[PDB]
Amino acid sequence: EHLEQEKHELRRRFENREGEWEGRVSELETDVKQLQDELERQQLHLRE
Amino acid sequence: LLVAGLKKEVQALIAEGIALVWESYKLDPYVQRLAETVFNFQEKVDDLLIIEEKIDLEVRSLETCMYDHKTFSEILNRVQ
């Protein structure tokens, strides 16, 4: 029973940190996308 | 009395769950276990209510049925 409880808590912390990793990856990709948009805008301003 | 055996089984599984906790993953087999046992307890209880009312009607008929052996014996055949 103690092994079973430990296994369940490991699955739980596993999934929680996995969701955290997905959120971090999505936020960094959002930063990359926004900053690329700003680079496009600045190049357009350069040509203007 | 007839459902006495079946009802205790639910109390046993209830007694089992009273020790379990959400931290164990034994909750989910237990959830499966309790539903099956409670499901059986509902069905068999429903069966007896149908049967027991029939027996209640049949024994009631003995009060008002005709006083001949065949009329009685036919009623005692249904209850048997």
Coordinates of N, CA, C and O in Angstrom, one line a residue:
Chain A
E1 N 0.8 -1.2 0.0 CA 0.0 0.0 0.0 C 0.9 1.3 0.0 O 0.5 2.2 -0.7
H2 N 2.0 1.3 0.8 CA 2.8 2.4 0.8 C 3.5 2.6 -0.6 O 3.6 3.7 -1.1
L3 N 3.9 1.5 -1.3 CA 4.4 1.6 -2.6 C 3.4 2.2 -3.6 O 3.7 3.0 -4.4
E4 N 2.1 1.8 -3.4 CA 1.1 2.3 -4.3 C 0.9 3.8 -4.1 O 0.7 4.5 -5.1
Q5 N 0.8 4.2 -2.8 CA 0.7 5.7 -2.6 C 1.8 6.5 -3.2 O 1.6 7.5 -3.8
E6 N 3.1 5.9 -3.0 CA 4.2 6.6 -3.5 C 4.2 6.7 -5.1 O 4.5 7.7 -5.7
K7 N 3.7 5.6 -5.7 CA 3.6 5.6 -7.1 C 2.6 6.6 -7.6 O 2.8 7.3 -8.6
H8 N 1.4 6.7 -6.9 CA 0.4 7.7 -7.3 C 0.9 9.1 -7.2 O 0.7 9.9 -8.1
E9 N 1.6 9.4 -6.1 CA 2.1 10.7 -5.9 C 3.2 11.1 -6.9 O 3.3 12.2 -7.4
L10 N 4.0 10.1 -7.3 CA 5.0 10.3 -8.4 C 4.3 10.6 -9.7 O 4.7 11.5 -10.4
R11 N 3.2 9.9 -10.0 CA 2.5 10.2 -11.3 C 1.9 11.6 -11.2 O 1.9 12.3 -12.2
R12 N 1.4 12.0 -10.0 CA 0.8 13.3 -9.9 C 1.9 14.4 -10.1 O 1.7 15.4 -10.8
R13 N 3.0 14.3 -9.4 CA 4.0 15.4 -9.5 C 4.6 15.4 -10.9 O 4.9 16.4 -11.5
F14 N 4.7 14.2 -11.5 CA 5.1 14.0 -12.9 C 4.2 14.9 -13.8 O 4.7 15.7 -14.6
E15 N 2.9 14.7 -13.7 CA 2.0 15.4 -14.6 C 2.0 16.9 -14.3 O 1.9 17.7 -15.2
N16 N 2.1 17.3 -13.0 CA 2.1 18.7 -12.7 C 3.3 19.4 -13.3 O 3.2 20.5 -14.0
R17 N 4.5 18.9 -13.1 CA 5.7 19.5 -13.7 C 5.6 19.4 -15.2 O 6.2 20.3 -15.9
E18 N 5.0 18.4 -15.8 CA 4.9 18.3 -17.2 C 4.0 19.5 -17.8 O 4.4 20.1 -18.8
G19 N 2.9 19.8 -17.1 CA 2.1 20.9 -17.5 C 2.8 22.2 -17.3 O 2.7 23.1 -18.2
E20 N 3.7 22.3 -16.3 CA 4.5 23.5 -16.1 C 5.5 23.7 -17.3 O 5.7 24.8 -17.8
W21 N 6.1 22.6 -17.7 CA 7.0 22.6 -18.9 C 6.3 23.1 -20.1 O 6.8 23.9 -20.9
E22 N 5.1 22.5 -20.3 CA 4.3 22.9 -21.5 C 4.0 24.4 -21.5 O 4.1 25.1 -22.5
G23 N 3.6 24.9 -20.3 CA 3.3 26.3 -20.2 C 4.5 27.2 -20.4 O 4.4 28.2 -21.1
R24 N 5.7 26.8 -19.9 CA 6.9 27.6 -20.1 C 7.3 27.6 -21.6 O 7.6 28.6 -22.1
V25 N 7.1 26.4 -22.3 CA 7.5 26.4 -23.7 C 6.5 27.3 -24.5 O 7.0 28.0 -25.4
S26 N 5.2 27.2 -24.2 CA 4.3 28.0 -24.9 C 4.6 29.5 -24.7 O 4.5 30.3 -25.6
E27 N 4.9 29.9 -23.4 CA 5.1 31.3 -23.2 C 6.4 31.8 -23.9 O 6.4 32.9 -24.4
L28 N 7.5 31.0 -23.9 CA 8.7 31.4 -24.6 C 8.4 31.5 -26.1 O 9.0 32.4 -26.8
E29 N 7.6 30.6 -26.6 CA 7.3 30.6 -28.1 C 6.5 31.9 -28.4 O 6.6 32.5 -29.4
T30 N 5.6 32.3 -27.4 CA 4.8 33.5 -27.6 C 5.8 34.7 -27.6 O 5.6 35.6 -28.4
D31 N 6.8 34.7 -26.7 CA 7.8 35.8 -26.7 C 8.5 35.8 -28.1 O 8.7 36.9 -28.6
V32 N 8.9 34.7 -28.6 CA 9.6 34.6 -29.9 C 8.7 35.2 -31.0 O 9.2 35.9 -31.8
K33 N 7.4 34.8 -31.0 CA 6.5 35.2 -32.0 C 6.3 36.7 -32.0 O 6.4 37.4 -33.0
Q34 N 6.0 37.3 -30.8 CA 5.8 38.7 -30.6 C 7.1 39.5 -31.0 O 7.0 40.5 -31.7
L35 N 8.3 39.0 -30.6 CA 9.5 39.7 -30.9 C 9.8 39.6 -32.4 O 10.4 40.6 -33.0
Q36 N 9.5 38.5 -33.1 CA 9.7 38.5 -34.5 C 8.7 39.4 -35.2 O 9.1 40.1 -36.2
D37 N 7.5 39.6 -34.7 CA 6.6 40.6 -35.3 C 7.2 42.0 -35.1 O 7.1 42.8 -36.1
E38 N 7.8 42.3 -34.0 CA 8.4 43.6 -33.7 C 9.6 43.8 -34.7 O 9.8 44.9 -35.1
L39 N 10.4 42.7 -34.9 CA 11.5 42.8 -35.8 C 11.0 43.1 -37.3 O 11.6 43.9 -38.0
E40 N 9.9 42.5 -37.7 CA 9.3 42.8 -39.0 C 8.8 44.3 -39.0 O 9.1 45.0 -40.0
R41 N 8.2 44.7 -37.9 CA 7.7 46.1 -37.9 C 8.9 47.1 -38.0 O 8.8 48.1 -38.6
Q42 N 10.0 46.8 -37.3 CA 11.2 47.7 -37.3 C 11.8 47.7 -38.7 O 12.3 48.7 -39.1
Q43 N 11.9 46.5 -39.3 CA 12.4 46.5 -40.7 C 11.5 47.3 -41.6 O 12.0 48.0 -42.5
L44 N 10.2 47.2 -41.5 CA 9.3 48.0 -42.3 C 9.5 49.5 -42.0 O 9.5 50.3 -42.9
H45 N 9.7 49.8 -40.7 CA 10.0 51.2 -40.4 C 11.4 51.7 -41.0 O 11.5 52.8 -41.4
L46 N 12.4 50.7 -41.0 CA 13.6 51.1 -41.6 C 13.5 51.4 -43.1 O 14.0 52.4 -43.6
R47 N 12.7 50.6 -43.8 CA 12.5 50.9 -45.3 C 11.6 52.1 -45.5 O 11.8 52.9 -46.4
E48 N 10.7 52.4 -44.6 CA 9.9 53.6 -44.7 C 10.7 54.8 -44.4 O 10.6 55.8 -45.1
Chain B
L1 N -34.4 -9.4 5.8 CA -33.6 -10.6 6.0 C -33.0 -11.1 4.7 O -31.9 -11.6 4.7
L2 N -33.8 -11.1 3.7 CA -33.4 -11.7 2.4 C -32.2 -10.9 1.8 O -31.3 -11.5 1.2
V3 N -32.2 -9.6 1.9 CA -31.1 -8.7 1.5 C -30.1 -8.5 2.5 O -29.2 -7.7 2.3
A4 N -30.1 -9.3 3.6 CA -29.2 -9.1 4.7 C -27.7 -9.4 4.2 O -26.8 -8.7 4.6
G5 N -27.6 -10.5 3.5 CA -26.2 -10.8 3.0 C -25.7 -9.8 2.0 O -24.5 -9.4 2.1
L6 N -26.5 -9.3 1.1 CA -26.1 -8.4 0.1 C -25.7 -7.0 0.7 O -24.8 -6.4 0.3
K7 N -26.6 -6.6 1.7 CA -26.3 -5.3 2.3 C -25.0 -5.2 3.0 O -24.3 -4.2 3.0
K8 N -24.7 -6.3 3.7 CA -23.4 -6.4 4.5 C -22.2 -6.2 3.6 O -21.2 -5.6 4.0
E9 N -22.3 -6.8 2.4 CA -21.2 -6.7 1.4 C -20.9 -5.2 1.1 O -19.7 -4.8 1.0
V10 N -21.9 -4.4 0.9 CA -21.7 -3.0 0.7 C -21.1 -2.3 1.9 O -20.2 -1.5 1.8
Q11 N -21.5 -2.7 3.1 CA -20.9 -2.2 4.4 C -19.5 -2.6 4.5 O -18.6 -1.9 5.0
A12 N -19.1 -3.8 4.0 CA -17.7 -4.2 3.9 C -16.9 -3.4 3.0 O -15.8 -2.9 3.4
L13 N -17.4 -3.2 1.8 CA -16.7 -2.3 0.9 C -16.6 -0.9 1.4 O -15.6 -0.2 1.3
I14 N -17.8 -0.4 2.0 CA -17.8 0.9 2.7 C -16.7 0.9 3.8 O -16.0 1.8 4.0
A15 N -16.6 -0.2 4.5 CA -15.6 -0.3 5.5 C -14.2 -0.3 4.9 O -13.3 0.2 5.5
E16 N -14.0 -0.9 3.7 CA -12.7 -0.8 3.1 C -12.4 0.6 2.6 O -11.3 1.0 2.8
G17 N -13.4 1.3 2.0 CA -13.1 2.7 1.6 C -12.8 3.6 2.7 O -12.1 4.6 2.5
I18 N -13.3 3.3 3.9 CA -13.1 4.2 5.1 C -11.6 4.2 5.5 O -11.2 5.2 6.1
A19 N -10.9 3.2 5.0 CA -9.4 3.3 5.2 C -8.7 3.9 4.1 O -7.6 4.4 4.3
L20 N -9.3 3.9 2.9 CA -8.6 4.4 1.7 C -8.5 5.9 1.8 O -9.2 6.6 2.5
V21 N -7.6 6.5 0.9 CA -7.4 7.9 0.8 C -7.2 8.3 -0.7 O -6.9 7.4 -1.5
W22 N -7.4 9.6 -1.0 CA -7.2 10.0 -2.3 C -5.7 9.9 -2.8 O -5.5 9.7 -4.0
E23 N -4.8 9.9 -1.9 CA -3.4 9.8 -2.2 C -3.0 8.4 -2.8 O -2.2 8.3 -3.7
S24 N -3.7 7.4 -2.3 CA -3.6 6.1 -2.9 C -4.3 6.1 -4.2 O -5.3 6.7 -4.4
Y25 N -3.7 5.4 -5.2 CA -4.5 5.1 -6.4 C -5.4 3.9 -6.3 O -6.1 3.6 -7.3
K26 N -5.5 3.3 -5.1 CA -6.5 2.3 -4.8 C -7.9 2.9 -4.9 O -8.9 2.1 -4.9
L27 N -8.1 4.2 -4.9 CA -9.4 4.8 -5.0 C -10.1 4.3 -6.2 O -11.3 4.1 -6.2
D28 N -9.3 4.3 -7.4 CA -10.0 4.1 -8.6 C -10.4 2.6 -8.9 O -11.6 2.4 -9.3
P29 N -9.6 1.6 -8.5 CA -10.2 0.3 -8.5 C -11.4 0.2 -7.5 O -12.4 -0.5 -7.7
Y30 N -11.2 0.9 -6.3 CA -12.3 0.9 -5.3 C -13.6 1.5 -5.9 O -14.7 1.0 -5.6
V31 N -13.4 2.6 -6.6 CA -14.6 3.2 -7.3 C -15.3 2.2 -8.2 O -16.5 2.1 -8.3
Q32 N -14.5 1.5 -9.0 CA -15.0 0.4 -9.8 C -15.7 -0.6 -9.0 O -16.7 -1.1 -9.3
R33 N -15.0 -1.0 -7.9 CA -15.6 -2.1 -7.1 C -16.9 -1.7 -6.4 O -17.9 -2.5 -6.4
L34 N -17.0 -0.5 -5.8 CA -18.2 -0.1 -5.1 C -19.4 0.0 -6.1 O -20.5 -0.4 -5.7
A35 N -19.1 0.5 -7.3 CA -20.2 0.7 -8.2 C -20.9 -0.6 -8.6 O -22.1 -0.8 -8.7
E36 N -20.0 -1.6 -8.8 CA -20.6 -3.0 -9.2 C -21.4 -3.6 -8.1 O -22.5 -4.0 -8.3
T37 N -20.8 -3.5 -6.9 CA -21.6 -4.1 -5.7 C -22.8 -3.3 -5.4 O -23.9 -4.0 -5.2
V38 N -22.8 -2.0 -5.4 CA -24.0 -1.2 -5.2 C -25.0 -1.5 -6.3 O -26.2 -1.5 -6.1
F39 N -24.5 -1.6 -7.6 CA -25.3 -1.9 -8.7 C -26.1 -3.2 -8.5 O -27.3 -3.3 -8.7
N40 N -25.4 -4.3 -8.0 CA -26.0 -5.5 -7.8 C -27.0 -5.4 -6.7 O -28.1 -6.0 -6.7
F41 N -26.7 -4.7 -5.6 CA -27.6 -4.6 -4.5 C -28.9 -3.9 -4.9 O -30.0 -4.3 -4.4
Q42 N -28.8 -2.9 -5.7 CA -30.1 -2.2 -6.2 C -30.9 -3.2 -7.0 O -32.1 -3.3 -6.8
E43 N -30.3 -4.0 -7.9 CA -31.1 -4.9 -8.8 C -31.8 -6.0 -8.0 O -33.0 -6.2 -8.1
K44 N -31.0 -6.7 -7.1 CA -31.6 -7.8 -6.3 C -32.7 -7.3 -5.4 O -33.7 -8.0 -5.2
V45 N -32.5 -6.1 -4.9 CA -33.6 -5.5 -4.0 C -34.8 -5.2 -4.9 O -36.0 -5.5 -4.5
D46 N -34.6 -4.7 -6.1 CA -35.7 -4.5 -7.0 C -36.5 -5.8 -7.4 O -37.7 -5.9 -7.5
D47 N -35.7 -6.9 -7.6 CA -36.3 -8.2 -7.8 C -37.2 -8.7 -6.7 O -38.3 -9.1 -6.9
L48 N -36.7 -8.5 -5.5 CA -37.4 -9.0 -4.3 C -38.7 -8.2 -4.1 O -39.8 -8.8 -3.8
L49 N -38.7 -6.9 -4.3 CA -39.9 -6.1 -4.2 C -41.0 -6.6 -5.1 O -42.2 -6.7 -4.7
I50 N -40.6 -6.9 -6.3 CA -41.6 -7.5 -7.3 C -42.1 -8.8 -6.8 O -43.4 -9.0 -6.7
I51 N -41.2 -9.7 -6.4 CA -41.6 -11.0 -5.9 C -42.4 -11.0 -4.6 O -43.4 -11.7 -4.5
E52 N -42.0 -10.1 -3.7 CA -42.5 -10.1 -2.4 C -44.0 -9.5 -2.4 O -44.8 -10.0 -1.7
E53 N -44.2 -8.5 -3.3 CA -45.6 -8.0 -3.4 C -46.5 -9.1 -4.0 O -47.6 -9.2 -3.6
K54 N -46.0 -9.9 -5.0 CA -46.8 -11.0 -5.5 C -47.1 -12.0 -4.4 O -48.3 -12.4 -4.3
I55 N -46.2 -12.3 -3.6 CA -46.4 -13.2 -2.5 C -47.4 -12.6 -1.5 O -48.3 -13.3 -1.0
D56 N -47.3 -11.3 -1.3 CA -48.2 -10.6 -0.4 C -49.6 -10.6 -0.9 O -50.6 -10.8 -0.2
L57 N -49.8 -10.4 -2.3 CA -51.1 -10.5 -2.9 C -51.6 -11.9 -2.8 O -52.8 -12.1 -2.5
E58 N -50.8 -12.9 -3.1 CA -51.2 -14.3 -3.1 C -51.7 -14.8 -1.7 O -52.7 -15.4 -1.6
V59 N -50.9 -14.4 -0.7 CA -51.3 -14.8 0.7 C -52.6 -14.1 1.1 O -53.5 -14.6 1.8
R60 N -52.7 -12.8 0.6 CA -54.0 -12.1 0.9 C -55.1 -12.7 0.2 O -56.3 -12.7 0.7
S61 N -54.9 -13.3 -1.0 CA -56.0 -14.0 -1.7 C -56.6 -15.1 -0.9 O -57.8 -15.5 -1.0
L62 N -55.8 -15.8 0.0 CA -56.2 -16.9 0.7 C -57.4 -16.5 1.7 O -58.2 -17.4 2.0
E63 N -57.4 -15.3 2.1 CA -58.5 -14.8 3.0 C -59.8 -14.8 2.2 O -60.8 -15.2 2.8
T64 N -59.8 -14.4 1.0 CA -61.0 -14.1 0.2 C -61.3 -15.1 -0.9 O -62.3 -15.1 -1.5
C65 N -60.4 -16.1 -1.1 CA -60.6 -17.1 -2.2 C -61.7 -18.0 -1.8 O -62.1 -18.2 -0.6
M66 N -62.2 -18.8 -2.8 CA -63.3 -19.7 -2.5 C -62.8 -20.9 -1.7 O -61.6 -21.3 -1.7
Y67 N -63.7 -21.4 -0.9 CA -63.4 -22.5 0.1 C -63.5 -23.8 -0.7 O -64.5 -24.6 -0.5
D68 N -62.5 -24.1 -1.5 CA -62.4 -25.5 -2.0 C -60.9 -25.8 -2.1 O -60.0 -24.8 -2.2
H69 N -60.5 -27.1 -2.1 CA -59.1 -27.4 -2.1 C -58.4 -27.0 -3.3 O -57.2 -26.5 -3.2
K70 N -59.0 -27.1 -4.5 CA -58.3 -26.7 -5.7 C -58.0 -25.2 -5.7 O -56.9 -24.8 -6.0
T71 N -59.0 -24.4 -5.3 CA -58.8 -22.9 -5.2 C -57.6 -22.6 -4.2 O -56.8 -21.8 -4.5
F72 N -57.7 -23.2 -3.1 CA -56.5 -23.0 -2.1 C -55.2 -23.6 -2.7 O -54.2 -22.9 -2.8
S73 N -55.3 -24.8 -3.2 CA -54.0 -25.5 -3.6 C -53.4 -24.7 -4.8 O -52.2 -24.7 -4.9
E74 N -54.3 -24.2 -5.7 CA -53.7 -23.4 -6.8 C -53.0 -22.2 -6.3 O -51.9 -21.8 -6.7
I75 N -53.6 -21.5 -5.3 CA -52.9 -20.4 -4.6 C -51.6 -20.8 -4.0 O -50.5 -20.1 -4.2
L76 N -51.6 -21.9 -3.3 CA -50.4 -22.4 -2.6 C -49.4 -22.9 -3.7 O -48.2 -23.0 -3.3
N77 N -49.8 -23.1 -4.9 CA -48.8 -23.4 -5.9 C -48.1 -22.2 -6.4 O -46.9 -22.2 -6.6
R78 N -48.9 -21.1 -6.5 CA -48.2 -19.8 -7.0 C -47.2 -19.3 -6.0 O -46.1 -19.0 -6.4
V79 N -47.5 -19.4 -4.7 CA -46.6 -18.9 -3.7 C -45.3 -19.8 -3.6 O -44.2 -19.3 -3.4
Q80 N -45.5 -21.1 -3.8 CA -44.3 -22.0 -3.8 C -43.4 -21.6 -4.9 O -42.2 -21.6 -4.7

